[PDB]
Every structure is written in structure tokens, then in C-alpha cells.
Amino acid sequence: MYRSHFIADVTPEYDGKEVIWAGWVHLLRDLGGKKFIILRDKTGLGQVVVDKNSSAFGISQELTQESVIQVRGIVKADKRAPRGIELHAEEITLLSKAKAPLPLDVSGKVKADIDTRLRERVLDLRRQEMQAVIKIQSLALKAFRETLYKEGFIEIFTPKIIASATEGGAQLFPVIYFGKEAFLAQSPQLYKELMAGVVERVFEVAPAWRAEESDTPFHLAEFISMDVEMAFADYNDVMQLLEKILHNIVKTIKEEGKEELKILNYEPPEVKIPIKRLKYTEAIEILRSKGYNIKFGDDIGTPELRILNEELKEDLYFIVDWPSDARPFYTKSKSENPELSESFDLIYKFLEIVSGSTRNHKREVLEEALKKKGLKPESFEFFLKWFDYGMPPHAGFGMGLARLMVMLTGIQSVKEIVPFPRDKKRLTP
Amino acid sequence: MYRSHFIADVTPEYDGKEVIWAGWVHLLRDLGGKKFIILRDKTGLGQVVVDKNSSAFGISQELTQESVIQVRGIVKADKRAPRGIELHAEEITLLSKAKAPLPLDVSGKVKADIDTRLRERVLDLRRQEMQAVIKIQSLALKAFRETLYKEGFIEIFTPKIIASATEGGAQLFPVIYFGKEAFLAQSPQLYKELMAGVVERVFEVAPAWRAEESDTPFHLAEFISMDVEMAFADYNDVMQLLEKILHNIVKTIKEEGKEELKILNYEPPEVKIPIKRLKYTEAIEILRSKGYNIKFGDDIGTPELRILNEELKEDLYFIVDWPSDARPFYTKSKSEPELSESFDLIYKFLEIVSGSTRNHKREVLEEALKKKGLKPESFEFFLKWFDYGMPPHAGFGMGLARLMVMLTGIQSVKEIVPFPRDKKRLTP
Ligand SMILES: [Cl-]
Ligand SMILES: [Cl-]
């Protein structure tokens, strides 16, 4: 196409050979009457030299950072040079010239806030660091599906535009839909249960949306959700599935993203099996005993997760068995105590990465649960009806991709992970 | 847990052994004082028989179709039975009791109305033919990504809510987005072009939406769209890749989806490399060479395509070099310009994929927008990025559901998509 080799394809064993590189002008320096071009392509950064008496010298002088070029030259081994080589330019073609100067420095280090970078997001995304994020995410999805296929999970796609919400109180985006006010789904919840009720084992990785104005970290309005629903399984089963998933994920990043982690100065945690389980009951007591005003039944906020993290000597733990009263109507209660529920959160340090549970499967227990939350059963008929015709016991979870990315990169901002973030003040690009 | 084995695991070399099945009561019949239960699960259909001398008998008497049960029994080989085995039940546990009668038959050759089936979609989808389709789509997706991984492609996700349209005059769904009227995207277009401009090779498989009120077949309002964008490629490179993808999908379906194709009575077309490339220009000349009322520059539609399917004796084929003015502003015109570097992939009479090489110069994008009679200033959110080194690139978008017709032979999009969405369909 526009090249014979990617930069990284060339080894010292290429000395004296003619190669064609293509890519971006990363840097441009002049030393000793020689022009040095650091070129960038998807494999990384090479070094090209244009000496005075080359025919490429003339055009090399008009080149600017982020212009796209083709360069044909002869490989020279060196060892003082990147990966032990450099390209001695003979011919350079200008494919696409960039305006100068740049509004954002692709090699300058992070200057300006998030919002200034989002005006020049492409230039920002081109930075080694962001490139590494984009790469790791892709590997993370591959490893996610791989584990699932091994367990015979079937990949699915459920409706994103829905008539009414599954959990009232959740704020959904209005969609004007052929004359009706419909909404954007917040999760595939009902549909994946349904599809579990037909082919048993299903996942979906896909967009979801939430309309709140919460300004805390990690609360984009649009977000990718990684969902799994498993028939003839309860919450302990799926927790063990996820363990294996997460393990294959970090293992893939560690082997296939060695270089990316290097650019990131980051080492994802070990996934020890089993992951520490801590009952919610016990979490409440650790908190109380350190002096926080927290009663059984209360939520466990970020501030609490910090102390929980600071106390467990574990970065990666499940919080299992929450109060039934704080979990959806579709979540199975504990048999030995109705006040508790067969649910879990997976926390990484102080961030929630996954939530799941064992679900209900009888219409009557579902209908009771709805009453126990003061909802009108007749208004969830769209959910209840399917359970008249043999819904099996099932269990599932949802993990947030970009939250999982924090565990895989070290980046502490979701707007730094998602290449085109959406929230209350952010719609473009 | 609930089972010890799936129905398809158990073979004759299991004789005398105890086995736990979990599944759905597909069929009940009584014969010779003996109860017959056709059990179903994700692997398929199995035969359980309950003797009158069994303790499982009494609960066996109250089972209804589609109930979820657990049957502990012993395997006996028979070779008159499915997979040469059946299960003589010792205990039966009732997990989920289903109401009687069923409003839709799972065991039946169910000739019912579409909206009637939508009303009871879970039962509908449990038919072997539907499970087939579901399973094949999964296999298709895996194969698709597998090919793209081999070539270095990176999986992206692009924004679904957007400020404004890319194709003007295209109808998008309004979203009320923090006080503003935003829209659902109809494709990742701009965004996958921008991602290719950072890491060269990308793909995305994700929902898109159009809001037109069509009444023609294969025009769901929400659809899963498989996109690929590739820097330093032109359309011919991306068509080659497309072929390589479709080849692998067909192979994977034929090898891994054997029983599914069996249930469906269907054989996928052969992806013959290279797939026929029919120049638009020649497509018009053929349509004229038989008796038709078409001129160069006119659109080729479904009538015209049924006709092309015949004339070409090829079921899979590209129509290429469409008139530049029938094509988006971001599609690059041919070097030698009334024509553009564009293609559509066709299966018989149905458009499956479209793509092209893209423009990458601000100037030519602006011009293209003037010559279509649009005002560049309104498209500034597209143009701006091309100021800072967008490389040559190209790409395509393939409808998952339309692909699916090629893989299954099913002629209705609402028989492929589990929970379809259109002007008169929102629930389920
Ligand atoms: Cl909801
Ligand atoms: Cl658009």
C-alpha cells in the first residue's frame, strides 16, 4: 500500500536494505547539517536521517509536525539508534500536509485541561500514552470474549431504545420515537435474562446511558457495559466465571500489552483466586469500629471504599450479600435471611467495577419484591409476563469497560480513557 | 449445580451411569404405561422416559411443556433413541412451573403472525430454528473479529449521541440530552475515520439508528452495524479485506455451525476469491442490454438488483465506481471524477456492505460540499480534523442482520433480530 514495512518490522538484520516507511512526522531536528525525522506509525517511533546531498533534503525542509509522509530509504544498523536502526532517506512524499503550528503537542507532555484537549482530541489521542490506552482496551475485550466462548457463552445484541424503565428512579434519556417518548436503555438487564431463558449462556458488550447530573469521577452519561447472564447458575457461579475472565484479561495485558504498560508505567494487580470476599455486614462493622456514622442498611460510598481498601490490604475484593432493600426487585433474596440478598459488587481499591446477582425466576416472588419497594406490579407487566412460561434460575453481572480500564492502566480519569466522552457539559466532539 | 452433563455430552459409553440433566420440557407423550419427556437445553433435545415403577412418576404426571426441570436418572443405550441414548429417570425436580396452555408452540412448526410471535418472543426464539440463528450470529461475530485481529485491527467504540448530522437530509432520532436536542448516530463514520487517523486500523460492532418511516423489507430503525476503517488503504485494499472476512465467516459457520445450517435447511454461498466486481457503468449497460428504462447516473435499486442477480450468474458481487454525485461528500472521486472510489457488496438482490476510499484533504472535502450544494461552515466539525494530518484511508460498514440473510437464508429481518425496532414496533 503506502509502505513495505511498519517501523517495528525492521531489525539490525536489515542493514543495507531498502525499506518504505509511512506515517506521521513526530519530531524534526537538525544537527550537523543533517535532518532527523522521528516518524510515527501504528507500531511506534522510528528515526529517519536525511543528509545534505540526498534528493529528499529539499522536501524534508518544508515538513511540519503531524504531516503524513511516505519515506523510501536504506536501513543502517547503529545501536545508538532506536531498536538499533535508522532509515537513511532517499525519497519522501507528502501525503497530507498539516497546518502549523500545532494547537496540541503530540510529543510535548500533557499541557492544558481535559476540555482544551477535547477540542484537539485526535492530536491528544495520538500521544503514546493514549495510543496505549486504546490498544489495551481492545485486548481487554478480546480476552473477555475468549474466556466466555470457552464456557460456551453466546454473544448477543439487545434493544437500546425501550418503552419504559426497568428500575423506576433511574433517569433515562428521552428519545422521540415515531411520536412517542421512548428512552435509552441503561443496561441490557431484562433482555439478557430473556435470552438466557432461551439459549442459557449470553454476553453483550455495548453502549448504555444514564441521565443524572452527578459530577463525581467516573460518571459519563454514555458508557460501554460488559454483560453476562448465565442460566442454572447463582451468584457464586458467576463470581467464579468473572474471576477467570479478569484473570485472562490481566494475563493478556501482561503478555500482549507489555510495551503499552511500559509506556504507562503501570502494572495491573494480580488476580488471586479466589478474590477476597467480604460480606456487607462485615464491611459495615469495619467501618463502625473505625468511628464512621454507618448503620446496617446504609450505602457504602467511595469515602467508605477508601477505608475498606486501606484496611483489607487487598486492592481487589468482592462486597457480597447486600441488603435486599438496596438491590433491584429482580435480585434473589437470601433463603436463610430475607433481609440480605444474593448480590455482589467487585471493587478495585475504591472503585466499583462490576455488579451482579442471583435473579428471581418466579412471577410471585418478583411481584412481591416490587410491592416491598412500593412499586405498582401492573406497571411492570412488560417484565413480569415472560416468567409465566418457564424462566430458569439464572444469574448475571455487568462490568463497566472504562472502570475496568482504571485497573488495567492506572489512569484515574474516565475522560482520559474514553476517547469521546459524553456528560452534562460534554457532547462534542 | 443443577446438572452434571449437557444432553449432547452423553454417549452410549455411558451405559448404566447416573447423569443429571437440567432443562425445558419440550414434549410430553404417554406410551405403553410409560411417560416420554423430550427434554431440551442449550445443546439440544434429549429423551427421558419415566416408568410407572418410578418415584419420579407422580411429579412426572403434573409437568407441563416449557417447565424447567432437573431429572436425575441412569443412561441406557438404545440407538433407536436420540444420539443412541435415553435417560431412565429416578428423581425429577421442578425448578420453574410454566402456565398451561402455551400461547405459542415451541415444539411445533409454528405458522403464526409476526406480531403474534413478538407478543411471545421468548417462546418463539426457543424454537430450534431461532436458536440456530442466534447461535450463527455469535459465530459470525467471532469470525469477523478473528480476521481483523490477524491484520492488526483495534476494537473501538464511538459516541452514539451526537450534536448534529454528517449526512444532511438524513433523518435521525432526537434525544433530549441535558436541555439540548441531540441525536442518535446512524453510523460511526466520522469517528472511525478519526480513530484510523490515530492508530490506523479500527473496527466497531455496535448499534446505529435511522428514523425514516420505511415500509420496505430490511429497514429496522435500530440495527447492528459492523464497521472497519483503515489508514493507508484505498477501496480495493478494503474490498480485499472484506472478502477475507466473509470467507472466514462462511467457513466458520460451515464448520462450527453444522447443526445450525442443518436445522435451517441452508447452505451459505461460496465466497469465491476474488468476488465479482461489476462497474456501475457496466451495470447500467447490462440493464439496458436487456429491456429496461434506466440511464447512466440513475440509482440501481432492488428491482434492478433482482435483474442483475440473474444476468451475472453470481450471487455475491460488488457494484463499484458509483457516480460521484450519488455518493457522500467524504467519498474520494476517481483520479481520471464523475465517478467515485466506492463499492456496494450485493447478495442476490440485497445490499450487504458499502464503503469507499475517503478524502483526507480539507480543500477537497469543502469543494465536495459546495458541489453538492451544502455550506462548508455547517460541516466544520467534520472538516477541522483534516487540518492536522489525516492520512489516506478507506473503510466500510456491513449490516449484521443483512449479512445474516446470507448466512441463514431467512428473508425477513424481523425473523433475524430478536427484539426488532421500527415505526410500529417498540415493545418488546
Ligand atoms: Cl431502567
Ligand atoms: Cl448522519
Side-chain angles (χ1 to χ4, degrees), chain A residues 1-75 77-78 81-108 110 112-214 216-269 271 273-294 296-312 314-334 337-338 340-363 365-375 377 379-424 426-429, chain B residues 1-12 14-52 54-75 77-78 81-106 108 112-214 216-271 273-294 296-310 312 314-366 368-369 371 373-374 376 378-428:
Chain A
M1 334 207 189
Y2 285 84
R3 40 162 78 105
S4 76
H5 300 70
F6 282 97
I7 286 148
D9 286 354
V10 190
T11 49
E13 225 174 343
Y14 267 104
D15 200 309
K17 220 26 255 199
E18 180 180 73
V19 159
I20 314 196
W21 279 353
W24 286 273
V25 175
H26 196 83
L27 277 147
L28 241 23
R29 308 281 157 158
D30 291 78
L31 185 76
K34 289 171 154 43
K35 181 148 308 268
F36 288 94
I37 314 174
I38 307 316
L39 186 77
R40 186 196 335 118
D41 76 11
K42 99 191 268 289
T43 63
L45 301 161
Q47 179 170 102
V48 356
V49 198
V50 206
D51 49 46
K52 280 273 165 177
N53 45 321
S54 187
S55 9
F57 187 59
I59 199 167
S60 74
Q61 289 275 41
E62 72 182 77
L63 292 185
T64 60
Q65 300 182 78
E66 291 318 291
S67 305
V68 173
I69 71 173
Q70 225 177 158
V71 55
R72 173 167 74 69
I74 282 79
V75 176
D78 199 292
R83 278 170 268 257
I85 55 114
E86 34 163 65
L87 221 210
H88 282 205
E90 302 280 316
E91 198 180 5
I92 288 146
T93 314
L94 221 202
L95 302 182
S96 183
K97 199 210 287 197
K99 297 220 195 298
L102 287 190
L104 194 151
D105 286 321
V106 177
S107 51
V110 191
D113 55 278
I114 216 329
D115 289 307
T116 306
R117 284 137 63 205
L118 296 173
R119 276 192 300 279
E120 300 294 340
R121 185 52 146 173
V122 163
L123 289 168
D124 186 60
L125 259 9
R126 285 180 186 161
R127 282 190 295 109
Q128 283 310 283
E129 294 72 30
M130 285 306 143
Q131 284 209 224
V133 182
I134 291 179
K135 283 182 279 192
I136 282 172
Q137 194 174 83
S138 176
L139 246 26
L141 293 157
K142 195 217 50 152
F144 171 79
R145 292 193 191 93
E146 175 186 68
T147 298
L148 282 155
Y149 295 133
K150 208 196 290 315
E151 306 289 329
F153 280 74
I154 287 155
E155 172 170 22
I156 68 162
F157 278 112
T158 50
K160 299 310 160 187
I161 295 172
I162 61 172
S164 59
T166 277
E167 313 148 48
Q171 299 182 53
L172 268 33
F173 291 116
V175 186
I176 313 313
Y177 185 77
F178 302 111
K180 298 195 199 127
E181 195 197 17
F183 316 97
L184 274 197
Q186 75 172 320
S187 106
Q189 195 56 54
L190 165 69
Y191 293 95
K192 66 188 192 180
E193 299 199 46
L194 293 197
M195 295 293 283
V198 338
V199 287
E200 284 183 77
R201 301 192 162 177
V202 295
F203 64 102
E204 152 162 45
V205 189
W209 302 268
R210 259 277 199 128
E212 281 81 14
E213 290 163 61
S214 187
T216 64
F218 286 90
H219 271 77
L220 305 184
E222 194 177 283
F223 51 92
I224 307 294
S225 171
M226 314 167 78
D227 282 277
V228 168
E229 204 62 25
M230 190 189 212
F232 307 101
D234 65 17
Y235 76 146
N236 298 129
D237 293 312
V238 298
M239 278 194 281
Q240 269 176 42
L241 205 218
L242 151 84
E243 281 181 337
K244 289 152 87 165
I245 290 183
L246 288 186
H247 185 82
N248 186 60
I249 287 173
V250 304
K251 194 192 190 225
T252 303
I253 308 312
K254 275 175 197 177
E255 280 163 21
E256 267 182 89
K258 213 180 154 190
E259 178 222 295
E260 282 72 22
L261 288 168
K262 204 213 164 181
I263 287 144
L264 290 162
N265 306 278
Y266 187 75
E267 171 79 355
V271 178
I273 295 160
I275 284 153
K276 177 96 168 94
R277 1 195 324 148
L278 180 74
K279 311 168 135 88
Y280 159 92
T281 297
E282 219 184 310
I284 283 319
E285 280 307 290
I286 280 149
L287 292 156
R288 276 188 91 252
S289 94
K290 292 244 169 282
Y292 297 93
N293 191 173
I294 197 148
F296 182 88
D298 301 357
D299 195 5
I300 299 186
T302 297
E304 281 88 283
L305 296 172
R306 282 194 177 98
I307 304 135
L308 281 185
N309 179 210
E310 258 348 284
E311 247 290 287
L312 283 164
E314 304 275 24
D315 284 356
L316 198 70
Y317 57 103
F318 289 111
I319 304 184
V320 307
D321 301 347
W322 295 73
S324 310
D325 324 67
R327 293 259 144 174
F329 73 98
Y330 51 75
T331 262
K332 180 144 160 209
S333 295
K334 291 197 104 191
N337 184 220
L340 293 185
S341 65
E342 282 190 28
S343 53
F344 72 95
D345 296 6
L346 181 63
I347 318 288
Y348 171 72
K349 300 193 191 174
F350 59 84
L351 188 66
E352 186 208 295
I353 301 259
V354 188
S355 60
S357 73
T358 308
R359 326 296 204 185
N360 295 141
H361 69 84
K362 291 144 182 337
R363 143 162 241 133
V365 46
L366 276 165
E367 254 166 14
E368 189 45 70
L370 287 162
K371 279 155 156 65
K372 211 177 187 289
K373 311 204 138 231
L375 287 333
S379 60
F380 293 89
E381 200 33 49
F382 77 100
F383 192 116
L384 298 168
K385 68 147 100 172
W386 309 108
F387 297 76
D388 287 326
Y389 303 118
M391 279 302 280
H394 56 294
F397 67 75
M399 160 156 75
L401 179 54
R403 259 141 190 264
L404 161 68
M405 287 286 304
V406 174
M407 172 192 210
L408 306 171
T409 55
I411 292 144
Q412 296 307 287
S413 179
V414 81
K415 308 145 76 169
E416 309 228 326
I417 286 152
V418 173
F420 298 108
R422 287 288 172 270
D423 63 30
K424 98 183 159 286
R426 278 172 280 253
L427 167 60
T428 82
Chain B
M1 291 320 304
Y2 289 97
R3 56 163 72 81
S4 84
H5 290 88
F6 286 101
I7 295 163
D9 293 344
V10 201
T11 49
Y14 268 98
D15 208 88
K17 263 129 162 209
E18 178 168 281
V19 133
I20 312 184
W21 280 354
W24 279 275
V25 182
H26 194 249
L27 271 176
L28 258 1
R29 291 256 30 186
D30 283 294
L31 223 208
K34 256 173 242 163
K35 199 150 314 251
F36 281 63
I37 307 195
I38 309 294
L39 225 229
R40 184 219 316 131
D41 69 18
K42 87 179 259 84
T43 56
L45 306 176
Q47 185 168 99
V48 359
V49 292
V50 205
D51 274 280
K52 284 197 96 98
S54 196
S55 35
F57 202 68
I59 204 168
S60 199
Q61 288 288 74
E62 40 192 59
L63 291 170
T64 51
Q65 300 187 91
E66 288 314 284
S67 282
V68 180
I69 64 173
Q70 208 185 19
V71 27
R72 182 179 48 89
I74 277 97
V75 194
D78 205 286
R83 277 169 234 85
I85 51 98
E86 81 199 53
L87 186 48
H88 302 324
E90 312 257 50
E91 213 193 354
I92 289 177
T93 302
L94 186 262
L95 308 165
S96 196
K97 189 168 230 291
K99 299 223 104 222
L102 289 190
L104 188 150
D105 292 300
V106 190
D113 184 78
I114 189 54
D115 282 305
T116 308
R117 275 140 56 214
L118 251 348
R119 235 170 289 122
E120 299 295 26
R121 191 53 145 183
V122 166
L123 295 166
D124 190 60
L125 287 164
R126 285 186 180 161
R127 298 185 283 113
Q128 290 304 301
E129 29 277 301
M130 271 331 297
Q131 289 203 239
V133 164
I134 292 159
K135 291 204 251 141
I136 286 182
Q137 177 174 266
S138 197
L139 283 171
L141 289 156
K142 171 168 119 226
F144 174 86
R145 291 192 190 91
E146 183 182 68
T147 296
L148 283 160
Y149 291 134
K150 233 167 267 324
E151 310 292 337
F153 279 74
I154 299 168
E155 188 167 18
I156 59 168
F157 280 102
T158 51
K160 298 318 159 202
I161 299 161
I162 52 151
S164 76
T166 288
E167 188 200 332
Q171 292 202 143
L172 269 30
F173 285 108
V175 185
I176 313 318
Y177 185 77
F178 303 102
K180 301 155 209 193
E181 197 205 13
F183 311 90
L184 286 180
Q186 70 169 311
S187 99
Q189 202 56 53
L190 191 238
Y191 288 95
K192 57 181 200 187
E193 283 177 79
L194 305 186
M195 297 295 268
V198 16
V199 302
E200 320 181 27
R201 305 174 172 213
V202 302
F203 73 86
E204 181 178 23
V205 177
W209 309 261
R210 264 259 219 162
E212 282 79 15
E213 299 199 89
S214 230
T216 61
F218 287 91
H219 279 85
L220 290 203
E222 167 175 293
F223 49 90
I224 306 285
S225 167
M226 318 145 91
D227 286 280
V228 155
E229 210 58 20
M230 182 177 218
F232 319 90
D234 69 12
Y235 67 151
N236 282 135
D237 293 324
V238 164
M239 283 187 279
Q240 265 159 59
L241 192 253
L242 180 53
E243 300 188 279
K244 192 122 93 275
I245 305 222
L246 285 175
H247 198 285
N248 192 34
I249 297 165
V250 172
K251 178 184 183 73
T252 298
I253 298 314
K254 277 180 189 155
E255 296 173 2
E256 292 166 63
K258 242 155 223 286
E259 300 311 288
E260 288 79 11
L261 281 50
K262 215 193 153 78
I263 297 176
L264 288 169
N265 297 286
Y266 185 73
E267 203 52 41
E270 212 172 273
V271 183
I273 318 214
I275 304 175
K276 181 71 188 296
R277 315 264 192 300
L278 175 65
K279 301 187 163 185
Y280 167 88
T281 291
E282 210 198 290
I284 262 65
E285 291 313 280
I286 292 166
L287 297 167
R288 293 175 95 255
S289 108
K290 296 212 193 108
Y292 225 78
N293 20 88
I294 193 137
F296 178 89
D298 287 324
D299 196 49
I300 295 157
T302 319
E304 282 94 286
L305 295 170
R306 284 202 210 72
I307 299 196
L308 281 184
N309 187 28
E310 293 184 74
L312 268 183
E314 264 297 333
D315 280 351
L316 212 42
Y317 65 97
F318 287 110
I319 303 185
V320 309
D321 305 341
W322 286 81
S324 75
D325 61 77
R327 287 276 141 163
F329 74 98
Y330 57 71
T331 284
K332 174 192 203 182
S333 289
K334 263 168 146 290
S335 281
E336 74 309 324
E338 243 201 287
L339 289 167
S340 53
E341 304 200 0
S342 41
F343 63 81
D344 294 349
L345 182 58
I346 306 301
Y347 178 57
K348 286 216 167 71
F349 43 82
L350 183 71
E351 200 205 274
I352 300 233
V353 182
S354 73
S356 76
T357 144
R358 321 321 191 162
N359 282 135
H360 61 110
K361 284 174 199 293
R362 162 160 228 154
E363 243 177 280
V364 307
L365 249 4
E366 269 175 347
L369 283 167
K371 254 182 94 284
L374 285 21
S378 56
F379 282 125
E380 185 49 35
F381 74 88
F382 198 101
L383 302 171
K384 50 169 299 182
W385 313 104
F386 293 78
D387 274 347
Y388 297 113
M390 289 279 130
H393 58 293
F396 70 76
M398 165 151 82
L400 178 53
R402 275 164 180 237
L403 167 66
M404 215 62 195
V405 172
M406 209 181 86
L407 302 171
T408 59
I410 293 147
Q411 297 301 119
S412 150
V413 75
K414 288 170 274 116
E415 265 160 72
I416 291 180
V417 181
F419 308 100
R421 284 296 177 271
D422 64 23
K423 76 176 176 304
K424 43 143 136 67
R425 279 169 276 250
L426 174 56
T427 86

